[PDB]
Amino acid sequence: NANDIRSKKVLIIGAGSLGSMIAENLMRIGVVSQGILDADLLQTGNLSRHALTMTSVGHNKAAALVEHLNRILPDASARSFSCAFPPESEVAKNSLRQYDVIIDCTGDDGVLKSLAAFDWKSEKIFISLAMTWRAEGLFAFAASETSFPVTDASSRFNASAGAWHPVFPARADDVQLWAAVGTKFICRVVSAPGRIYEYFKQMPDGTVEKEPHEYGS
């Protein structure tokens, strides 16, 4: 109950490829109280690796994603922030401070720094998810702190660092794979919060491995 993500207010910063698919996965499992933050417009070049369709081209990614999420469940309560992080409005900042789980899906080092400088005013569950260049791997970081630990996150990221092959550019199936793994990561972290870092890798034979190894041979 208190470790159930479905009862949590979840903020996703970044409504691009990975963030949009994770947000949809989380809504379908019942995470109805979502905030989506993104300043960018959806463009046609995004469509090959996104949750949304051509009907959202030219619309703010966060506003358009929220419209989609709110069509999934009768009690969906997604809200959009059509701005960069952090917002300038103090009313908007206080709205963001109401969320329990803060998920960075931007792959942007500037956002990590902004997360650490922002005053969250109470302890949060912070999660940072991003893929490698050709989506061969997934960086998964989580912390339960009052301030986001950008230095430790960066240290963990740096230490780990046909067209179906992982060594080819990232396609929709690659992003869906990591959105699925990332959604599971989010659920597991919120169920047992703490400082956690995992690095996932997809293999040419279709398998998926994790560092550190935990399950199986």
């Binding site: 490829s17 990975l18 080092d109 260049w133 989506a135 960066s154 780990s160 660092a161």
Partner: peptide, 5 residues
């Protein structure tokens, strides 16, 4: 590190 999302 190059990260993408």
């Amino acid at each position: 590190t190059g990260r993408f999302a």
